Amino acid sequence: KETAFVEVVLFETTYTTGLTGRFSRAGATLSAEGEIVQMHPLGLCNNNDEEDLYEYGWVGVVKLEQPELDPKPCLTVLGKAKRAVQRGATAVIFDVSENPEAIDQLNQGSEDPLKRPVVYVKGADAIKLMNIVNKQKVARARIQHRPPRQPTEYFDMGIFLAFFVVVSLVCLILLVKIKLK
Amino acid sequence: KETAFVEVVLFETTYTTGLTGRFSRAGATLSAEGEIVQMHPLGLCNNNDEEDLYEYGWVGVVKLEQPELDPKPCLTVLGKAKRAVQRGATAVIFDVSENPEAIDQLNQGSEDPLKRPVVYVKGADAIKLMNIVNKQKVARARIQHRPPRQEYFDMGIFLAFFVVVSLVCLILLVKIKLK
Amino acid sequence: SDLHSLVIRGASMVQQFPNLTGTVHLESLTLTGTKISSIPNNLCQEQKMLRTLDLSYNNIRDLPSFNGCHALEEISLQRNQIYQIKEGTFQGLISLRILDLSRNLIHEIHSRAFATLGPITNLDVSFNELTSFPTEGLNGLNQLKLVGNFKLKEALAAKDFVNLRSLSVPYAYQCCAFWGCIIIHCTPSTGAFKPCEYLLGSWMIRLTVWFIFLVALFFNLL
Amino acid sequence: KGCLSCSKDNGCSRCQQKLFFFLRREGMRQYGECLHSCPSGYYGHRAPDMNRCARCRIENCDSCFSKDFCTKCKVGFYLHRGRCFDECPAGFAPLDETMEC
Amino acid sequence: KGCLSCSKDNGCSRCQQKLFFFLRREGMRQYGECLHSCPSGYYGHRAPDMNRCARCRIENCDSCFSKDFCTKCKVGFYLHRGRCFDECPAGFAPLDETMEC
Numbered sequence: 001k002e003t004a005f006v007e008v009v010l011f012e013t014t015y016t017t018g019l020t021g022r023f024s025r026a027g028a029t030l031s032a033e034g035e036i037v038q039m040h041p042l043g044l045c046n047n048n049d050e051e052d053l054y055e056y057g058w059v060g061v062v063k064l065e066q067p068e069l070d071p072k073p074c075l076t077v078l079g080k081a082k083r084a085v086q087r088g089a090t091a092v093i094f095d096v097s098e099n100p101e102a103i104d105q106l107n108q109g110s111e112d113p114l115k116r117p118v119v120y121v122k123g124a125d126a127i128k129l130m131n132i133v134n135k136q137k138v139a140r141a142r143i144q145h146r147p148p149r150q151p152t153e154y155f156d157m158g159i160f161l162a163f164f165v166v167v168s169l170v171c172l173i174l175l176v177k178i179k180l181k
Numbered sequence: 182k183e184t185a186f187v188e189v190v191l192f193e194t195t196y197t198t199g200l201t202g203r204f205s206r207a208g209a210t211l212s213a214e215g216e217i218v219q220m221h222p223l224g225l226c227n228n229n230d231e232e233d234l235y236e237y238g239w240v241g242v243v244k245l246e247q248p249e250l251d252p253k254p255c256l257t258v259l260g261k262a263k264r265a266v267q268r269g270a271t272a273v274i275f276d277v278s279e280n281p282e283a284i285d286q287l288n289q290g291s292e293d294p295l296k297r298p299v300v301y302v303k304g305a306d307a308i309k310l311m312n313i314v315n316k317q318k319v320a321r322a323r324i325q326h327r328p329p330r331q332e333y334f335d336m337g338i339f340l341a342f343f344v345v346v347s348l349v350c351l352i353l354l355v356k357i358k359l360k
Numbered sequence: 361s362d363l364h365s366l367v368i369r370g371a372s373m374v375q376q377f378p379n380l381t382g383t384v385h386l387e388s389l390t391l392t393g394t395k396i397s398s399i400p401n402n403l404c405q406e407q408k409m410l411r412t413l414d415l416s417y418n419n420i421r422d423l424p425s426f427n428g429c430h431a432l433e434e435i436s437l438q439r440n441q442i443y444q445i446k447e448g449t450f451q452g453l454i455s456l457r458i459l460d461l462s463r464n465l466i467h468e469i470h471s472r473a474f475a476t477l478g479p480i481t482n483l484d485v486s487f488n489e490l491t492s493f494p495t496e497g498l499n500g501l502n503q504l505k506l507v508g509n510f511k512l513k514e515a516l517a518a519k520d521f522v523n524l525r526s527l528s529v530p531y532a533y534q535c536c537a538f539w540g541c542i543i544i545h546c547t548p549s550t551g552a553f554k555p556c557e558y559l560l561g562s563w564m565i566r567l568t569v570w571f572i573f574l575v576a577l578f579f580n581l582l
Numbered sequence: 583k584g585c586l587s588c589s590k591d592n593g594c595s596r597c598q599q600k601l602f603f604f605l606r607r608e609g610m611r612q613y614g615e616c617l618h619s620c621p622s623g624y625y626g627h628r629a630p631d632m633n634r635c636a637r638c639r640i641e642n643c644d645s646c647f648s649k650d651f652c653t654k655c656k657v658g659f660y661l662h663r664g665r666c667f668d669e670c671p672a673g674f675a676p677l678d679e680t681m682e683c
Numbered sequence: 684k685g686c687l688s689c690s691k692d693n694g695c696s697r698c699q700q701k702l703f704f705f706l707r708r709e710g711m712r713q714y715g716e717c718l719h720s721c722p723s724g725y726y727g728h729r730a731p732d733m734n735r736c737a738r739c740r741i742e743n744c745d746s747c748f749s750k751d752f753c754t755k756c757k758v759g760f761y762l763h764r765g766r767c768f769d770e771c772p773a774g775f776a777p778l779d780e781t782m783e784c
């Protein structure tokens with residue numbers, strides 16, 4: 001559940017613009033890439049037995065609306081992601097900047113893991129993504145697992161030596177009381 | 182020499198088959214994903230004036246031929262990969278199972294790194310990849326590198342040398358008492 | 361003669377399989393919230409083109425032979441009371457993708473029970489508390505989870521499973537011995553406390569504890 | 583716009599009580615707005631909560647009435663009851679110069 | 684068919700002596716097959732090294748001779764010298780009974 005430095009590509013020449021977002025526990029965190037295809041919160045329903053199909057592979061952008069606007073949503077937020085993966089998506093970018101409660105909706109979905117990554121982009125950083133999905137005709141989204149490099153097994157190596165120094169030094173002051181006796 | 186985790190997907194329910202390869206020190210090692218587009222080694226030349234263009238984003242598979250077969254190759258192996266990225270590719274997968282010298286051809290050219298990953302798949306693993314590019318009509322390839330853990334092997338040196346440091350001092354204490 | 365679907369669910373009073381002596385063109389047959397204990401053996405004699413077969417919440421004692429009917433795609437037999445699986449249950453059965461048997465009373469799976477099926481992509485045999493698990497012909501599945509099988513202690517062979525990607529074994533000692541990460545994701549993660557190669561881990565720390573026990577007793581007797 | 587909410591990036595999310603709700607996606611963005619009638623090749627489907635303008639599935643149909651009944655068929659097929667047939671059975675007018683049967 | 688290498692994955696990767704080398708793409712695989720003449724919509728290009736059958740860039744052409752000399756234009760146009768013109772100028776008939784300006 002680390003950050004996700006999602007970057008979009010605007011080809012014809014290739015201009016790249018990146019932005020940061022947070023992974024979610026709804027699906028396993030991996031790296032995926034595909035054409036960015038916006039969906040609608042009400043378009044990811046299940047009662048529609050016949051829906052238009054897309055090509056396999058597409059990073060879907062879902063702009064979440066206010067939870068109080070609709071009296072009864074058809075499916076849960078973590079259900080929309082599972083429906084979208086069935087449509088042939090590889091990743092979903094839930095713009096949760098308007099429904100803050102949706103973050104907890106995804107984070108409680110640890111009971112049933114999903115095979116594909118799910119990302120939520122909040123704050124004013126999602127405005128940049130929305131402007132890209134609005135202005136440019138075609139773009140390409142690109143998300144990568146653990147975008148930074150965290151020296152998890154490298155930064156703590158020398159901490160043990162400092163831990164041992166205290167053990168080696170606390171015994172020396174004990175000799176002072178030995179000499180005073 | 183870092184391992185590459187490449188798998189293919191088949192839209193219909195999506196069966197997934199994976200295989201392993203080695204990254205190369207010619208393009209920045211990072212994950213990428215796209216459709217498999219086989220490219221003939223001779224089709225990636227530069228003297229051509231105009232050629233048909235593909236949609237942006239495609240993992241190209243290039244099966245190298247024997248070096249002695251081509252006396253005057255149009256471009257170097259690194260040149261092939263650089264041309265494909267300009268063409269619109271996102272991750273070029275080679276097949277050096279027939280031209281072993283290409284690994285040196287790539288790892289030597291470390292002066293100008295490429296923006297996108299370059300992978301070479303050798304041995305009998307490329308046979309399975311070719312049996313997929315030969316049979317299936319549409320495939321979907323993702324390449325990834327996620328090495329986790331190592332986190333106790335790193336602190337092992339710190340823990341081990343510490344005990345030697347502690348014991349060598351005790352040795353001298355016993356030595357000096359009897360003398 | 362034109363019916364395609366038949367989805368009965370919640371029929372919590374019927375205790376007999378429905379009469380289908382004239383419907384031979386359905387695609388999916390579903391009897392979920394039921395109480396059905398005897399699937400008729402003469403099933404593949406008709407319904408020769410179904411591509412789904414769901415009978416989950418209804419106490420089923422045993423299973424018939426699905427001899428033929430090579431258009432069947434998915435099966436699901438959960439919450440049943442299937443004590444045993446014979447070898448002739450899945451003769452042929454090409455293009456069968458998903459097969460669930462979770463939460464039943466399975467204790468013995470015949471060895472020659474998965475050698476004839478087609479390219480199964482998923483196969484879930486969970487919470488059954490069996491003892492042995494044949495792996496003959498399971499060399500194509502991408503996900504196989506056995507979680508509630510604490511009675512099963514045997515270590516699965518990794519030679520049979522080649523393209524497997526998701527594996528959930530009862531104990532975290534089969535996943536580690538499976539040598540995953542080809543990359544394989546295992547739900548019962550072994551973490552760090554449960555090793556597979558060396559109990560002490562690295563060779564450095566082993567050289568340290570080798571000194572401890574060597575001296576903690578040689579001087580102690582003195 | 584037609585509806586009331588109509589967020590400036592997502593379209594008109596929740597429509598009114600007597601208008602339809604059609605998801606128009608062009609390029610990448612997909613948004614919807616209230617419509618009085620299904621535009622073309624769609625069939626209105628009213629509901630007590632949200633009127634959905636769904637998509638037709640009967641082939642060779644340019645304008646439908648339900649999920650199975652076609653109103654105006656394609657320019658190459660004539661219609662007999664609700665379908666778009668290429669063969670006109672006996673006892674009926676062949677085409678009447680108006681693409682019917 | 685008939686070449687020197689003819690590997691099972693790239694097709695035949697070296698023409699014989701005087702034949703054209705053409706890259707046939709279908710589905711995903713792009714196997715190189717060697718031909719006597721450019722099939723259609725291509726123009727042969729001899730060379731002392733390798734005979735490449737290249738693609739025409741001249742507009743509205745079904746069979747060409749050089750990079751910019753169409754031999755048989757599209758049915759909707761007429762050819763004056765090498766190009767495919769819709770308008771036929773003076774001095775020559777608009778069709779000459781053979782789709783030729």
Ligand SMILES: CC(C)CCC[C@@H](C)[C@H]1CC[C@H]2[C@@H]3CC=C4C[C@@H](O)CC[C@]4(C)[C@H]3CC[C@]12C
Nearest residue numbers: 164165166168169171172175346347350351354
């Ligand atoms: C952080 C680590 C590396 C520090 C290690 C400190 C070591 C070198 C120090 C800590 C305590 C020290 C001992 C303290 C007291 C005595 C008793 C004296 O009669 C002889 C020296 C002797 C035996 C010292 C030898 C050096 C010693 C063992």
Ligand SMILES: CC(C)CCC[C@@H](C)[C@H]1CC[C@H]2[C@@H]3CC=C4C[C@@H](O)CC[C@]4(C)[C@H]3CC[C@]12C
Nearest residue numbers: 164166167168169171172175178347350351354
């Ligand atoms: C850092 C840890 C692991 C080291 C463990 C051993 C330590 C505790 C040992 C190593 C050397 C030891 C010293 C060796 C010799 C003497 C001199 C004696 O007149 C008083 C005790 C004293 C001063 C010892 C105190 C304990 C001591 C410092």
